[PDB]
């Protein structure tokens, strides 16, 4: 039919920048996380370059990008693939990797994003809520699914 509509919710975010329930009794998360299968393509939001590229034990495989602003730092955890390669120039909506399970032991798939000034750690980490709230295609700047 030509016409449908349904109230179903909107946002694929489960753990927002802030607090974080899942500690003992105190303790933050230093990012974004969105709900999102094994094999969603993952694009970058801004217009960046690739500067790392790793895996860890606490992550699994983690890209990441530098802004061209000089001072901004991003990173992506939990990925099962890479579209891009350290060196390479990406523009905001460019495929940059492929959404897993590679370091995650609760609560399943999701993307990890990360974004840090002045240098790269949680120490150097800030809120990528209303910087996400900005962008041409908001949270879905992240993701295809
Ligand atoms: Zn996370």
Same mark, same amino acid.
């Given at each position: 039919?030509?016409? &449908?509509?349904?109230?179903?919710?909107?946002?694929?975010?489960?753990?927002?920048?802030?607090? =974080?329930?899942? !500690? /003992?009794?105190d303790?933050?998360?230093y990012?974004?996380?969105?709900?999102l /299968?094994?094999?969603?393509? #993952?694009?970058?939001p801004?217009?960046?370059?690739?500067?790392?590229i790793?895996?860890?034990?606490?992550?699994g495989? @983690?890209?990441? #990008?530098?802004?061209?602003?000089?001072?901004?730092?991003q &990173?992506?955890?939990?990925?099962?693939? =890479?579209? @891009?390669? @350290?060196?390479?120039?990406?523009?905001?909506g460019?495929?940059?990797? =492929? !959404?897993?399970?590679?370091?995650?032991?609760?609560?399943?798939?999701?993307?990890?994003?990360?974004?840090?000034?002045?240098?790269?750690?949680?120490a =150097?980490?800030?809120?990528?809520?209303?910087?996400?709230?900005?962008? /041409?295609?908001?949270?879905?700047?992240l993701?295809?699914?």
């Amino acid at each position: 039919g030509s016409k &449908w509509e349904d109230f179903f919710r909107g946002s694929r975010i489960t753990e927002t920048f802030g607090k =974080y329930q899942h !500690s /003992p009794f105190d303790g933050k998360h230093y990012g974004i996380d969105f709900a999102l /299968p094994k094999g969603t393509p #993952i694009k970058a939001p801004t217009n960046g370059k690739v500067t790392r590229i790793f895996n860890n034990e606490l992550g699994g495989k @983690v890209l990441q #990008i530098a802004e061209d602003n000089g001072e901004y730092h991003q &990173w992506y955890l939990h990925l099962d693939k =890479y579209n @891009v390669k @350290v060196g390479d120039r990406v523009k905001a909506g460019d495929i940059i990797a =492929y !959404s897993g399970n590679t370091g995650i032991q609760t609560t399943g798939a999701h993307l990890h994003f990360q974004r840090m000034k002045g240098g790269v750690g949680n120490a =150097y980490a800030e809120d990528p809520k209303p910087f996400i709230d900005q962008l /041409p295609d908001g949270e879905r700047s992240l993701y295809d699914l």
